[PDB]
């Protein structure tokens, strides 16, 4: 595929690296940094590398319109569930303390300025922007203006829109990641179109590419990795009894262990070229192809052709099958017994 | 990808259907009509479409030979354990009678001339040439000449070999599948090079293309679903704990179900394009994209720039975030209150 890399503090993103699995704890945790304690202890338990926040600053993220607007995954204003969820600066200094003293990174998506001002206050290692800010070009340039690598959601954007995103951080100088999204909660398999992965590395030779997914389960993300991608987000419980609404999408501990053992199969799995020669295949090529051997009893003198030769595993034969209508017109250098393999010096 | 598709019996297959899992109960019956019934049985139970049987003939398949070579997994001649697994022309044909009396369809793979002369007199519907007879022109030929699709292994050979069984195949003219496939048994992950796939359909843009697998478990067939394959080929054994040198490799009733349920979702998670505009997440594009507000009190006829002017959920303003800088130098048409969305009556 390709050989981008870069690195989320001290961990290697690319094609050539292990995936990376982003366990999105969100607003997950209504508001309480104690439920967000229990659920990145899950996360650290679980073998998680990286546990992502999101940062609602909610005045600088919404205008007085957004206490009207209802998301599709609820029955409340969007206004109203931030402002239940929202951490406010002093509890998520707290939680990125809590996440890197359990030796796990901890990054976070901005919804607002205001947010980005202040995990840059906080310095973290790499940021995340959400497919709704993918098209926030304002925003991507504060965001790119810190220097520190971006992974850019693309879902409701068009090539064409994610183009200008792109072009912002590429003049920033810092490398990015694109993760192919969809953002319906929960999404059915027939709209997560993996294809569109394909779509985006052909447009952006630079980028590193995954998935963020919002699925009931992982096969979306086992068929991002197979196709190439680096980086897979989902959204991360410690039970799945916890309400909210995003939890019916989100992997609990034993999920994302199945996605950790799965991406890492397919890993190893996935690309590579159809004529590498694969050295355990030498004994099997050994016996399973064939050889050119006599179909009749052949009298020293007379002609071999089709209506005497055929060919039989093993492939130890001086004529392998591929040889096998060169020898037509040859002549019988002595008797050949039916069934035995014939020998370079059975022929004149 | 494709629209390539041809029928098994009443069964389409190919990028546009659903895909087909092959359970090859192969020699794991070890020799016994009565163990191959309890395998179709568990075949049947756990909801296979397809049977494949191999047929030995072991007089035709090898010579003398064969007696002398052994495979990398097991500990005795190929000779020895084909003679021992084989079933004679009576059992086969009670065999593919029982599969067919469980509404499945049976298909084999002939190892010979002998083999696949037998089966024609079965008349299967369609043939499968093992990844050891793909260079075997000769018999490929005669199995060609039946008249019915061939679904073609092609593990250890180029692409430059298998391009003479596809000119045999389609001078034939009959449809025919390239299955993707690694000879080791079991095989590594990283010997699976799932990349081969896209290799065999850009050389071969005729072929329905698939995976034959010899790995311990269902990813490498799950990432083969995601990158386009319409067949996938394991081992089917009803219980784990029977001996034989191909069950370790092979699937079980639960693990079969695994697998039809994972190709199901990423079937239809596979492919699309990025661009596509789906449905249902215009309600988040409502909330979630943002439009221009005033970032500070401006009076009448002050100008609009970006120091007076932002941008915030959500995406119902006059103003989208994409039109931000195309207000600055615009004039207020009358004052402003911080934070308000701007309207098209605010700006002379
Ligand atoms: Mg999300
Ligand atoms: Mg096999």
Redesign the interface.
């Given at each position: 595929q390709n050989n981008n890399e870069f690195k989320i503090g001290n961990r290697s993103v690319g094609y050539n690296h292990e995936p990376l699995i982003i366990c999105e704890i969100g607003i997950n945790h209504e508001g309480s940094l104690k439920t967000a304690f229990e659920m990145v202890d899950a996360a650290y338990n679980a073998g998680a590398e990286v546990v992502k926040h999101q940062t609602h600053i909610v005045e600088?993220?919404?205008?007085?319109?957004?206490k009207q607007?209802?998301?599709?995954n609820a029955d409340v204003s969007?206004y109203e569930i931030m402002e239940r969820c929202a951490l406010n600066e002093e509890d998520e200094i707290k939680l990125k303390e809590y996440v890197e003293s359990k030796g796990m990174i901890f990054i976070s998506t901005p919804?607002?300025?205001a947010a980005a001002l202040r995990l840059q206050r906080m310095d973290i290692p790499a940021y995340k922007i959400?497919?709704?800010?993918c098209?926030?070009?304002?925003?991507i340039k504060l965001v790119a203006s810190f220097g520190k690598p971006i992974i850019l959601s693309?879902?409701?954007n068009?090539?064409e829109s994610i183009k200008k995103s792109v072009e912002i951080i590429r003049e920033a100088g810092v490398p990015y990641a694109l993760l192919?999204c969809?953002?319906?909660?929960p999404?059915?398999?027939?709209?997560?179109?993996?294809?569109?992965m394909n779509?985006?590395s052909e447009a952006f030779p630079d980028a590193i590419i995954g998935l963020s997914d919002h699925?009931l389960?992982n096969?979306?993300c086992?068929?991002?990795?197979?196709?190439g991608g680096s980086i897979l987000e989902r959204h991360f419980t410690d039970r799945m009894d916890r309400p909210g609404p995003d939890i019916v999408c989100s992997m609990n501990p034993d999920t994302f262990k199945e996605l950790k053992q799965?991406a890492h199969?397919?890993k190893?799995?996935?690309?590579?070229?159809?004529?590498?020669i694969?050295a355990?295949?030498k004994?099997?090529?050994?016996?399973?192809?064939?050889?050119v051997?006599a179909d009749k009893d052949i009298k020293k003198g007379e002609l071999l052709s089709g209506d005497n030769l055929?060919?039989?595993?093993?492939g130890?034969?001086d004529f392998s099958?591929?040889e096998?209508e060169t020898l037509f017109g040859k002549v019988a250098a002595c008797n050949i017994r039916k069934?035995?393999?014939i020998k370079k010096t059975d022929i004149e």
């Amino acid at each position: 595929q390709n050989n981008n890399e870069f690195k989320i503090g001290n961990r290697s993103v690319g094609y050539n690296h292990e995936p990376l699995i982003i366990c999105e704890i969100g607003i997950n945790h209504e508001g309480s940094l104690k439920t967000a304690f229990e659920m990145v202890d899950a996360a650290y338990n679980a073998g998680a590398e990286v546990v992502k926040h999101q940062t609602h600053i909610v005045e600088d993220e919404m205008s007085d319109e957004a206490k009207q607007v209802i998301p599709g995954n609820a029955d409340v204003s969007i206004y109203e569930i931030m402002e239940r969820c929202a951490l406010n600066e002093e509890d998520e200094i707290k939680l990125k303390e809590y996440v890197e003293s359990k030796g796990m990174i901890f990054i976070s998506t901005p919804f607002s300025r205001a947010a980005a001002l202040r995990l840059q206050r906080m310095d973290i290692p790499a940021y995340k922007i959400g497919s709704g800010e993918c098209n926030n070009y304002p925003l991507i340039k504060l965001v790119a203006s810190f220097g520190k690598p971006i992974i850019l959601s693309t879902g409701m954007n068009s090539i064409e829109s994610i183009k200008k995103s792109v072009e912002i951080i590429r003049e920033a100088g810092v490398p990015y990641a694109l993760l192919h999204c969809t953002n319906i909660y929960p999404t059915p398999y027939e709209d997560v179109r993996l294809g569109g992965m394909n779509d985006l590395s052909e447009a952006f030779p630079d980028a590193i590419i995954g998935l963020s997914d919002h699925t009931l389960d992982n096969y979306a993300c086992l068929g991002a990795v197979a196709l190439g991608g680096s980086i897979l987000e989902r959204h991360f419980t410690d039970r799945m009894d916890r309400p909210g609404p995003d939890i019916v999408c989100s992997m609990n501990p034993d999920t994302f262990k199945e996605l950790k053992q799965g991406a890492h199969a397919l890993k190893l799995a996935r690309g590579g070229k159809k004529d590498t020669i694969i050295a355990g295949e030498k004994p099997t090529k050994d016996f399973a192809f064939a050889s050119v051997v006599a179909d009749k009893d052949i009298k020293k003198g007379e002609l071999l052709s089709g209506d005497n030769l055929w060919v039989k595993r093993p492939g130890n034969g001086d004529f392998s099958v591929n040889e096998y209508e060169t020898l037509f017109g040859k002549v019988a250098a002595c008797n050949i017994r039916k069934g035995a393999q014939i020998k370079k010096t059975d022929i004149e």
